[PDB]
Symmetry: C5
Subunit: 150 residues, 5 copies
């Protein structure tokens, strides 16, 4: 009868599950070709760590399933959507999307322009799951004491 009391174990378990995820991308900028083997393990570890995190079925994850489906129906399509954009952009270079193909062969230099979106992407998620976790427990923001601005 602890179906609704599962979120508690998902919160403390999400902390580490998210931290390891942020580092994954930090190493994806290189695994893009140098060693994509790690990228394939990290992406499968996140979906395998969550699916196995509810195998006991002793806490009645049923309820936590439906609710998790409303959120899982976008996080997986968006998480692999940004990864492919780059995993396919390398070859899309010929598209000349830029203002000139003068730096075509000079692209291997790796200006690390990929960390410009990932960096702010990890902080946004970490703060999106941290504020949402302490918010849901309130619903009407009774003890939120977070912003209180608006």
């Amino acid at each position: 009868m602890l179906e609704r009391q599962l979120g508690y174990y998902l919160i403390q378990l999400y902390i580490p599950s998210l931290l390891i995820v942020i580092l994954s991308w930090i190493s994806f900028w290189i695994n893009l070709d140098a060693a994509p083997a790690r990228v394939g393990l990290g992406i499968t570890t996140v979906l395998t760590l969550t699916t196995q995190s509810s195998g006991s079925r002793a806490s009645l994850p049923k309820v936590s399933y439906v609710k998790a489906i409303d959120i899982w129906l976008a996080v997986c399509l968006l998480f692999v959507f940004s990864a492919l954009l780059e995993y396919a952009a390398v070859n899309f270079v010929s598209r000349q999307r830029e203002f000139g193909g003068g730096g075509f062969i000079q692209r291997a230099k790796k200006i690390d322009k990929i960390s410009r979106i990932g960096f702010p992407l990890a902080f946004l998620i970490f703060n999106l799951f941290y504020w949402i976790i302490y918010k849901i427990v309130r619903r009407e923001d009774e003890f939120e004491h977070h912003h209180h601005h608006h």
Copy 2:
């Protein structure tokens, strides 16, 4: 009891399962050799996402199995049939199938001629499963209101 009522969950679940599939090929172009590691994960994710999508067996997927077998007995043989054609064409270049082997070493340029079949291949499938889903529910096209041209 809800064996025939499973198609509903397969429809909304197919949307995301198909979208991620289309993007897979878009990257398969470069993954052809640059990083085929991703191509191997995406191809196994589609067959693993469907087989696991009916593990509960609470909706009695039995009926949905037989019907799914009549369609699964071609989609898997055709999906991996086109992928191999290219995965083996790279070395088939020596065959000189073209009108001349003058551009043998100039083939690495990657003219992106592979996106000429994939692009229209994704739209055909997306529209083939979208029109078929809203059609099957009718059988005799009672509320189809799709073409009505005939």
Copy 3:
């Protein structure tokens, strides 16, 4: 109760399982090093497609097991025996097994001499499982009407 009646499902299921296998080798000549990632997935897909094809245990695959063991005790040792011969031959070049090491560095040309054994290897298996399937059902060749020469 349908233990001996399983061969029927194995026949129609072997057709597609064999077709996809033949194509695997056709792409192995290149995956030998260019992208062996696919070769590892195709080889594991055949053994995983059969082992999972009898997970229901509703047709009593028991009987079909002992009989499948007499044949499985050679097809797996021979299937991976020919693959290794080539997967290890590349480095065996130094052996100078040929009539001269003059074409050592000129071996990368890939004369496609590997398709000389694979081609006839796929047709032999396809015809070996097709004639054996329609033969076993007879035992004494009552309605064979295949050769009738001898």
Copy 4:
């Protein structure tokens, strides 16, 4: 009944599980790019060897679970934390973290400066699990007879 008596099987089982882990890093140096395929198997073998080491559930690993959670909530986040630092440092070279980018292209030389942290990292863990195992059984250090210094 033997939930608290599981540590015994975990101790003798940890010896070999730790030894194989130390060797993993020793090879991770070259696997960093030369062949990261092995690094991905060794990292998944440690988490798969432990999770499967308690599948019997005949010794009531329940109790051993909670206690293992207090330690597993850092060993996995720290083990993959150091691996990524290097798996992403290769490309971080452009950061010029050093005192000069003069040896940028001369970095491939592989001075083996990575074995300076791994070596002492394996001995620290081996001695951390060896002294902790013989210590926990005491709690108050009754028969420790290890240091007895201060």
Copy 5:
């Protein structure tokens, strides 16, 4: 119970399991970097072929487990111990363990000096499991008739 009568199925099953293992190393030479993907599948196939060879639990593998543990507690630590030595030796070249680093870049030649230990390593194991299998059944060597020398 046929717990002690399991060794019979393990003997005839070990023959093929060992043969495929010997060939694995023969290819590991080139797979050391050229295509280590196969080496990772062969090493996981041996541990996966044995663990799954006792999934039925109908023959009461319990007894065969304890006895198998006394031998499995060294074969796995020694099998992966020799593989790592080479998988990490490539980078250990800088160690100058040899009598001179004059042939540093001339090491890629691949003198096939690795087959000097593997060859005799496969024959030793094949004869170690063949003589031990026909010996255990005797215990006191009643019908051994193998050596009878001294």
